């Protein structure tokens, strides 16, 4: 009965679907304005390097499900996702002279491949399974568990919890190449770095726990 | 027994006492049938009372509208209490202006009632009905006159169950705040007509560069009011024409008024304490420019430079207060993206 | 607070009658100026029923209409006549002022191109500022030897008329062909009356604000120089639907650049809750450019259509692109100056209008102040 | 961020109208431009509903259709007539460009086979003049004709931001093979399907590819190599689709290698099997890429119109497109020595020679320098 009157009209399930939707279209126009700050400027933009803490308002009937320490994890993946959209869009909005373009495809590929991995293979695989699971909710408690077994696993596949200075930092430092090369628009000294860090990336990730091979091809 | 159904009972009884076919015997037998049930089931006690409430309310709604021209009284309320007939109150201010700026005394109570009565006849609005029901009061001996002005309404008998002196009290508070902003915009518009009249000093432009600035802070503050009055009123007028129950009216109307205290930024102290300073600060400005016929030379320009040092800060101060419903106010204030520079 | 209306010139006397037959039709007023049986505040334009009009060959055409009981071509020639009937007409004007309770403004309908208008309309604006100094003088002037009559008049409208609305016949004749398919004067005037009628909608019906002519103009004109406006009439359905058609220059009667302030008038029964939703998407799309120097906003107002007679719409625009129309005229003026008692008044008039076009071109800069 | 369409000549007006037919058929918009009761963000391709269409003899035919509520033969001939109405048409563009909140692109449907090729040549040089921050994509259609064709190439080689070839001969082949017709009114039925399915990710929002610049720039390695060819086999798992796509029987083009592949999947397929399909494509190695740059294949998921079964579209950047140019090029050298300055025709022949000579070098292990 509760779920029935919650599709229209304390629909906890309806609120949950919107949650993972207003981040992870609409949010495309939002970030593009940030590319070209102030704390009130953003709000009117939203209502229309690593910060932007986002929160939301949840009614008591669903407060027990979407806890307070649950907001931060949902915020954690949102921060990292934007940096990927940033590098992906920064190298995309523009259009030994032509030699720079060979450094573009050699790079615009790599960030693009990673983005195809986090969103599709992870942020849409477990998402498709999670919805098929919540529709069979039969308990107050287990609905927390099926939910808590969705964040603590999506925070592991997306490598953000541990092995950060061992693996995650590598993707982080090469992301700085997406910033440096974007502004300039020394060239030889980039591929010496790029061919090194990229090989550093594969020769480190080569230890593969098993799901990392879906990107290890490149 | 829940307190809700207790509110239903008292209404049906008072509505017949004040009132002094087939709807009588049927209610008797139902009351008697309940006494034979060896179990008092609360789900059934309400099942018969809710029909009786909706029965006397339906017939009363007929007498309150069709023969006697609840909706009609509500329209009168929205007019005079909520400044619905705003044109009447600008001519009322034009006449009852000098007899209110001085501190109020025991005679100004009646000195203004003849002005208000003269105001309704001044806009050819003539009705011996509903005119003597509005008697302006002055809270005297327990300060400018506007700080004690009030408007009372003598409710009829059938509507006394819905209009207690308490609900007519919260209405009175709104009438004071809405009349205040309507007063400052009027005298401010007169200043606009004073600069335009003075078409042919280098410092003479500093007035309108601040006047037109201080005009948008009040005019837009005076907007969002038709977008909160003519909108909430559109819902309350809908809630009655949909439900046949009387309890719905007593809660929807009580809910309708509660929004006016919140949406109109009255209960929230900070927004109520910030724009409050814009009111009396503007009084000094419009008075200063009207208190002279030439340029502000003898320390007048030395006085204008004092308010701008306070007002311009308050402009950015409210900009920080904004950054639930303030978007409906900030959208109009920043559609031109000027406050982004402050 | 009543508004006495004056009508001069053939064009002015013609549009007024079509403005009058339109207004009395919206109310329950018979052509015999008597109420018919069939809330609407009717005091602003009518005296207790007679309209507060002063009409100044064409008069015969008006008295022959069933509305009878309702009451040369050179700039120098028109003015000379004015000073000769100076005393005669003012007693007509003065008696109407004392008759009103609290006179507020002066609506005037005249054409700069019209000789009588270029001679008699110009003379009144100087006398009106002399006799009554505390009364606004707003005119519904309409742009069309022809350039001479135009520029000489603009010299007065920039210092006497504290407000003004321009109606260009070129764009009007254009709109007649594309969306009306007429090809005369008798057809284009139909749309002219629609503008003036909806322009004074908020005054004739009791509302919350906008209960005086000052209530509309003061938000538009910030400075005594920037005193030119423009109109736009869309219907020739939600609140967001009507606004997107306003800002299109395809309907505005006109032939960087940015506005100053916008006033929107809605005559329908639309739900007033979603109007704040419409403005948000407009700011998101950024369909109109604004001034960065001073605080400005976009406004909207609601009213009720005449029941005795569906959503309409009228917009009041203060655009700097209107300066171009002046340049075109003054350009032709300089063209006739080099091809053809003192010939000096026409010289200073060219200089003072140079300040106006300068003020607008300097208004679209981040440093318009000083 | 919206995209405005422009239909030029009999061809462009024909292909656009049918495309606007099916697009209005897919969306829940009745032919009378009135919403039907019966999830889709349509502000990019519709204005509140009137399409942002700029049409340019066939005008009578469009009006005669019940969709009236929805709004010589020389190349130098078209070029002259375009300057004559320079401000005549650009006011319609400007009233809509400035009438659009934030314009994003410029799609063009035109045939370079008579006057639309000349007028189209006029728009490109003109659009680059005024709008420097606006994308220009052209859905040009290919087959005295060699002349008009080669000039439009010279203009399209440096003006347009992208290009999608649509040759009639290859389209003529599909007309008989899988349809058994032998008609102009029938071949375009596929062209509209090619157009509509191309922008499905933009009309139905998803996670990736929320802007047209997001799709194209993944393919184009350098602004010189901005020529694309498409694929549409469905006329079944994710692996069945892509393998059906690489067969040259389906490609709409009449050593060599690819540059990059972008795929569109519109069915109800599962995102669990797509990453494995790419592997079997690599292991079995049904296609080769450039030897210099590490090339990738991309594929996107979408949602079919509910108001309307697994279908798919393929976009390709294949260096075999050079052969198509060389044919008309040979045809030009044929009529040049066979029959007031006649000098611009040589300038066009020089630049198109550059692009071809870059194709042949683009597929070599030493594309650098
Ligand atoms: N909009 C409009 N303009 C008019 C009308 N009648 C005349 N005009 C304008 O008046 C100008 C001609 O002036 P004219 O009537 O000869 O002046 P008069 O000889 O002093 O009356 C033309 O340029 C017209 O644009 C009318 O009915 N409507
Ligand atoms: N595939 C295809 N080609 C077309 C169609 N309509 C016209 N064409 C081509 O367009 C060319 C003629 O273009 P034309 O009518 O002269 O363009 P215009 O000079 O601008 O009017 C021919 O070579 C046709 O092959 C169509 O519906 N489908």
Q: Which chain D positions have a beta carbon within 8 Å of A28's beta carbon?
A: 210-211
Contact C104, C3 (CB under 8 A): yes
Q: Do C244 and D102 lie within an 8 Å CB cutoff?
A: no
> Would you call C57 exposed, middle or buried from its count of C-beta atoms within 10 A (0-12, 13-18, 19+)?
exposed
Residue B176 host element (H or E):
helix B167-197
Residues 6+ apart with CB under 8 A from B100: B108, B112, B144, B145, B146, B149
Q: Are strands C2-7 and C103-109 parallel, antiparallel or unpaired?
A: parallel
Residues belonging to the binding site of D for GTP are 113-118
Kindly list the distances between the CA atom of residue C258 and the CA atoms of B150, B154, B341, in Å, as whole numbers in the listed order: 46, 54, 18
Contact D9, D114 (CB under 8 A): yes
Q: Are strands C50-51 and C53-55 parallel, antiparallel or unpaired?
A: unpaired
Tell me the CA–centroid distance for residue D168 and ligand 2, in Å: 10
- How far apart CA C113 and CA C153 sit, in angstroms, is 9
- How far apart CA B271 and CA C259 sit, in angstroms, is 31
- How far apart CA B28 and CA D127 sit, in angstroms, is 86
Number of Cβ within a 10 Å radius of residue B194:
15
- How far apart CA C215 and CA D111 sit, in angstroms, is 58
Q: Of D275, D266, D235, D256, which Cα lies nearest the Cα of D324?
A: D256
Which chains have at least 3 CB atom pairs separated by less than 8 Å from chain B? A, C
- How far apart CA C37 and CA D212 sit, in angstroms, is 63
Contact D263, D244 (CB under 8 A): no
Q: Which chain A positions have a beta carbon within 8 Å of C281's beta carbon?
A: 48
> Would you call D150 exposed, middle or buried from its count of C-beta atoms within 10 A (0-12, 13-18, 19+)?
buried
Q: What is the DSSP letter of D53?
A: E
What atom in ligand 1 is closest to the CA of residue C117? 20
Number of Cβ within a 10 Å radius of residue C36:
10
- How far apart CA D175 and CA D235 sit, in angstroms, is 12
For chain B, the residue count is: 342
Q: Which residue on chain A is closest to D368 by alpha carbon?
A: A99
- How far apart CA D308 and CA D25 sit, in angstroms, is 7
Contact B270, B317 (CB under 8 A): no
Q: In what order do the strands lie in the sheet with C230-233?
A: C230-233, C314-319, C259-266, C298-302
DSSP letter string, B45-104? HHHHHHHHHHHHHHHHHHIIIII---HHHHHHHHHHTTTSSHHHHHHHHHHTTHHHHSPP
Kindly list the distances between the CA atom of residue D240 and the CA atoms of C303, C310, D247, D268, in Å, as whole numbers in the listed order: 63, 55, 12, 14
- How far apart CA A158 and CA A214 sit, in angstroms, is 12
> Would you call C222 exposed, middle or buried from its count of C-beta atoms within 10 A (0-12, 13-18, 19+)?
buried
Interface C-D: count of C-beta contacts within 8 A:
16
Q: In what order do the strands lie in the sheet with C2-7?
A: C53-55, C2-7, C103-109, C136-139, C163-164
Contact D79, D122 (CB under 8 A): yes
Number of Cβ within a 10 Å radius of residue B44:
14
Interface A-C: count of C-beta contacts within 8 A:
7
Kindly list the distances between the CA atom of residue D367 and the CA atoms of C87, D352, D360, in Å, as whole numbers in the listed order: 94, 19, 10
Q: C339: which 2 tokens? A: 């091809």
Q: Chain D: give the shortest CA distance to residue C223, in Å.
A: 28
Ligand that lies nearest to the alpha carbon of residue D167, given by its number in the listed order: 2
Q: Do B213 and C43 lie within an 8 Å CB cutoff?
A: no
Rounded (5°) CA angle C41-C44-C45: 110
Q: Does C237 touch chain D (CB under 8 A)?
A: no
Q: What is the DSSP letter of D320?
A: G
Q: Which chain C positions have a beta carbon within 8 Å of B87's beta carbon?
A: 41, 206-207, 211
Kindly list the distances between the CA atom of residue A46 and the CA atoms of A15, A31, A43, A50, D100, in Å, as whole numbers in the listed order: 19, 9, 5, 18, 21
Q: Tokens 């948008």 label which residue?
A: B216
Q: Which chain B positions have a beta carbon within 8 Å of A39's beta carbon?
A: 323
Q: What ranges in chain D are assigned the alpha helix state H?
A: 9-26, 58-64, 75-84, 86-97, 115-130, 145-156, 168-177, 184-198, 200-203, 212-216, 238-245, 274-284, 322-336, 344-362
Q: Do C283 and A47 lie within an 8 Å CB cutoff?
A: no
Query: What letters, b where the CB count within 10 A reaches 16 and e where it falls short, cover A51-82?
Result: eeeeeeebeeebeebbeeebbebbebbbbbbb
Q: Do D294 and A106 lie within an 8 Å CB cutoff?
A: yes
**C-beta contacts of B254-257 below 8 A and 24+ residues apart:** B254/B167, B256/B232, B257/B167, B257/B170, B257/B171
Return the axis-axis angle of helices A140-157 and A68-93, rounded to nearest 10°. 40
Tell me the CA–centroid distance for residue D131 and ligand 2, in Å: 29
Q: Chain A: give the shortest CA distance to residue B327, in Å.
A: 8
Q: Which chain C positions have a beta carbon within 8 Å of B217's beta carbon?
A: 295
Kindly list the distances between the CA atom of residue D51 and the CA atoms of A195, C273, D5, D16, in Å, as whole numbers in the listed order: 49, 28, 9, 11
Q: Of C193, C209, C368, which Cα lies nearest the Cα of C303?
A: C209
What atom in ligand 2 is closest to the CA of residue D57? 21
Residues 6+ apart with CB under 8 A from C287: C244, C247, D99, D101
Contact C254, C230 (CB under 8 A): yes
Task: Measure CB to CB from residue D101 to each of C240, C241, C285 and give the nearest one.
Answer: C285
Tell me the CA–centroid distance for residue C123 and ligand 1, in Å: 18
Contact D303, D204 (CB under 8 A): yes
Q: A196: which 2 tokens? A: 């090194």
Return the axis-axis angle of helices D322-336 and D145-156, rounded to nearest 10°. 130
Q: Of B84, B115, B85, which Cα lies nearest the Cα of B98?
A: B115
Phi-psi region for residue D23, left (φ > 0), alpha (ψ -120 to 50) or beta? alpha
Q: B121: which 2 tokens? A: 């006849």
Task: Measure CB to CB from residue C248 to each of D48, D99, D101 and give the nearest one.
Answer: D99
Q: Chain C: give the shortest CA distance to residue A41, in Å.
A: 13
Q: Do D294 and A123 lie within an 8 Å CB cutoff?
A: no
Mutate to test the interface with C, among D47, D93, D98 (most CBs of C within 10 A): D98
Q: Is C114 annotated as a binding residue?
A: yes
Residues 6+ apart with CB under 8 A from A68: none
Q: D259: which 2 tokens? A: 């540059």
Q: Of C4, C352, C20, which Cα lies nearest the Cα of C196?
A: C20
Contact A87, A178 (CB under 8 A): yes
Q: Chain D: give the shortest CA distance to residue C278, in Å.
A: 12
Indicate which residue's Cα is closest to atom 9 of ligand 2: D11
Q: Which residue on chain D is closest to A99 by alpha carbon?
A: D368
- How far apart CA D125 and CA D128 sit, in angstroms, is 5
Q: How many angstroms is the resolution? A: 23.2
Q: Which chain C positions have a beta carbon within 8 Å of B124's beta carbon?
A: 43, 48
Q: Of A129, A88, A131, which Cα lies nearest the Cα of A111?
A: A88
Q: Are strands D162-163 and D137-138 parallel, antiparallel or unpaired?
A: parallel
SS3 C238: coil
Q: Do B323 and A47 lie within an 8 Å CB cutoff?
A: no
- How far apart CA B56 and CA B12 sit, in angstroms, is 7
Q: Does D34 touch chain C (CB under 8 A)?
A: no
Task: Measure CB to CB from residue D221 to each of A29, A105, A124 and give the nearest one.
Answer: A105
Q: Which residue on chain B is closest to A46 by alpha carbon?
A: B327
> Would you call B297 exposed, middle or buried from its count of C-beta atoms within 10 A (0-12, 13-18, 19+)?
exposed
- Around ligand 2, the residues with Cβ closer than 6 Å are D 9-11, 14, 73, 111, 113-116, 141, 168, 171, 184, 187-188
Q: B100: which 2 tokens? A: 């209110």
Q: Which residue on chain D is closest to C247 by alpha carbon?
A: D99
Q: Which residue on chain C is closest to A46 by alpha carbon?
A: C284
Contact C317, C230 (CB under 8 A): yes
Tell me the CA–centroid distance for residue C171 and ligand 1, in Å: 15
């Amino acid at each position: 009965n509760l779920m029935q009157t919650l599709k229209k009209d304390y629909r906890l399930v309806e609120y949950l679907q919107a949650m993972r939707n207003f981040f992870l279209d609409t949010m495309y126009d939002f970030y593009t304005s940030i590319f070209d700050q102030n704390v009130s400027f953003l709000n009117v933009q939203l209502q229309e390097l690593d910060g932007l803490t986002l929160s939301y308002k949840v009614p008591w009937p669903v407060d027990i499900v979407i806890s307070l320490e649950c907001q931060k994890i949902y915020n954690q993946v949102f921060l990292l996702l934007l940096q990927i959209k940033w590098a992906k869009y920064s190298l995309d909005v523009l259009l030994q002279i032509h030699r720079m373009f060979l450094l573009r495809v050699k790079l615009m590929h790599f960030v693009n491949s990673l983005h195809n991995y986090i969103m599709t293979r992870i942020l849409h695989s477990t998402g498709l399974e999670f919805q098929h699971q919540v529709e069979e909710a039969k308990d107050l408690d287990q609905l927390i568990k099926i939910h808590y077994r969705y964040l603590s696993t999506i925070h592991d596949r997306c490598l953000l919890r541990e092995k950060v200075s061992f693996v995650k930092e590598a993707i982080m430092k090469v992301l700085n190449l997406a910033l440096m090369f974007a502004d300039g628009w020394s060239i030889e000294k980039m591929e010496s770095d790029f061919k090194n860090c990229h090989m550093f990336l594969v020769t480190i990730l080569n230890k593969a726990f098993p799901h990392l091979e879906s990107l290890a091809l490149s | 027994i829940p307190v809700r159904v207790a509110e239903k009972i008292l209404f049906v009884g008072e509505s017949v006492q004040m009132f002094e076919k087939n709807q009588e015997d049927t209610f008797a037998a139902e009351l008697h049938r309940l006494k034979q049930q060896p179990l008092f089931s609360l789900v059934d006690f309400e099942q018969v009372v809710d029909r009786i409430r909706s029965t006397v309310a339906e017939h009363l709604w007929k007498l309150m509208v069709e023969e006697s021209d609840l909706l009609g009284q509500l329209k009168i309320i929205k007019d005079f209490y909520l400044l619905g007939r705003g044109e009447l109150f600008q001519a009322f201010i034009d006449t009852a202006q000098h007899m209110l700026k001085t501190p109020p005394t025991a005679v100004t109570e009646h000195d203004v009632n003849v002005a208000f009565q003269q105001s309704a006849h001044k806009v050819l609005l003539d009705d011996d009905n509903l005119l003597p029901l509005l008697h302006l009061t002055i809270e005297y001996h327990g300060a400018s006159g506007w700080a004690a002005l009030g408007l009372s309404y003598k409710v009829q008998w059938p509507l006394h169950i819905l209009f207690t002196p308490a609900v007519l009290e919260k209405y009175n508070v709104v009438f004071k705040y809405l009349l205040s902003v309507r007063r400052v915009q009027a005298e401010l518009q007169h200043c606009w007509a004073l600069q335009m009249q003075r078409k042919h000093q280098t410092d003479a432009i500093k007035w309108r560069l601040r006047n037109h600035m201080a005009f948008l802070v009040d005019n837009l503050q005076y907007y969002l009011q038709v977008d909160v009055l003519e909108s909430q009123f559109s819902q309350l007028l809908h809630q009655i024409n949909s439900t046949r129950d009387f309890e719905s009216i007593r809660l929807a109307h009580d809910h309708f008024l509660s929004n006016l205290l919140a949406q109109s930024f009255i209960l929230l102290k900070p927004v109520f304490h910030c724009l409050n300073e814009i009111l009396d600060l503007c009084h000094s400005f419009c008075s200063l420019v009207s208190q002279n016929l030439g340029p502000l030379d003898e320390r007048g320009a030395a006085q204008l430079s004092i308010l701008v040092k306070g007002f311009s800060r308050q402009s950015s101060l409210l900009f920080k207060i904004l950054s639930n419903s303030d978007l409906a106010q900030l959208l109009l204030r920043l559609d031109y993206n000027k406050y982004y520079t402050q | 607070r009543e508004i006495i209306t004056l009508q001069l010139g053939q064009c002015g006397n013609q549009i007024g009658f079509e403005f009058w037959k339109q207004l009395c039709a919206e109310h329950g007023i018979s052509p015999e100026g008597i109420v018919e049986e069939f809330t609407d505040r009717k005091d602003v334009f009518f005296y207790q029923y007679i309209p507060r009009a002063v009409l100044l060959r064409v008069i015969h055409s008006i008295l022959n209409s069933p509305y009878a009981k309702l009451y040369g071509n050179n700039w120098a020639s028109g003015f000379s006549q004015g000073e000769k009937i100076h005393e005669d007409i003012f007693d007509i004007i003065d008696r109407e002022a004392d008759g009103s309770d609290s006179l507020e403004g002066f609506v005037l309908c005249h054409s700069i191109a019209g000789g009588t208008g270029s001679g008699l309309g110009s003379y009144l604006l100087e006398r009106l500022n002399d006799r009554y100094p505390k009364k606004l003088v707003q005119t519904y002037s309409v742009f069309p030897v022809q350039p001479y009559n135009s520029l000489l008049t603009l010299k007065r409208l920039t210092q006497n008329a504290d407000c003004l609305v321009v109606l260009d016949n070129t764009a009007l004749n254009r709109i007649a062909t594309d969306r009306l398919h007429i090809q005369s004067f008798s057809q284009i005037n139909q749309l002219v009356s629609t503008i003036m009628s909806a322009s004074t909608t908020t005054l004739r019906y009791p509302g919350y604000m906008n209960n005086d002519l000052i209530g509309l103009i003061a938000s538009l004109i910030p400075t005594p120089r920037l005193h030119f406006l423009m109109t736009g009439y869309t219907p020739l359905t939600t609140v967001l639907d009507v606004m997107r058609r306003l800002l299109q220059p395809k309907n505005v009667m006109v032939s960087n650049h940015c506005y100053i302030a916008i006033l929107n008038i809605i005559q329908g029964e639309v739900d007033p809750t979603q109007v704040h939703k419409s403005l948000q998407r407009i700011r998101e799309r950024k369909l109109a450019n604004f001034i960065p120097w001073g605080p400005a906003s976009i406004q909207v107002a609601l009213s009720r259509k005449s029941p005795y007679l569906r959503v309409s719409g009228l917009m009041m625009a203060n655009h700097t692109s209107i300066s171009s129309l002046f340049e075109r005229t003054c350009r032709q003026y300089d063209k006739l100056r080099k091809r053809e008692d003192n010939f000096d008044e026409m010289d200073t008039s060219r200089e003072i209008v140079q300040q106006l076009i300068d003020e607008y071109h300097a208004a679209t800069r981040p440093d318009y102040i000083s």
